[PDB]
């Protein structure tokens, strides 16, 4: 893009954030959110928008 500001924001629905490959919750990865040694988050796992079932 060639505009004045190149910053943009996308709204993500909470349903998308899930563990990769639909596995269970490990100690350091609860509900698709990475957790460090303390309670703070480090990174998030985002699925892909699948409208068709396949």
């Amino acid at each position: 893009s060639s505009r004045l500001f190149r910053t943009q924001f996308r709204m993500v629905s909470p349903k998308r954030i899930s563990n990769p490959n639909n596995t269970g919750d490990s100690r350091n990865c609860r509900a698709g959110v990475q957790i460090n040694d303390s309670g703070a988050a480090l990174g998030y796992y985002v699925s892909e928008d699948g409208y068709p079932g396949w």
Binding site: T23, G24, S26
Partner: protein, 48 residues
């Protein structure tokens, strides 16, 4: 009634080697279950 003297120098707890490697590596998620039985299912996955 006894006049002997004693001093204890060191006391050690000998232990045997133990490391749950198979649990550590593979079985990484745990599913606690309130009900009586657990079901594991499979699918053939073969399409001509």
């Amino acid at each position: 009634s006894m006049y002997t003297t004693a001093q204890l120098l060191a006391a050690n707890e000998q232990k045997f080697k133990f490391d749950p490697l198979f649990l550590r590596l593979f079985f990484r998620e745990s599913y606690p279950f309130t009900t009586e039985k657990v079901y594991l299912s499979q699918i053939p996955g073969l399409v001509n």
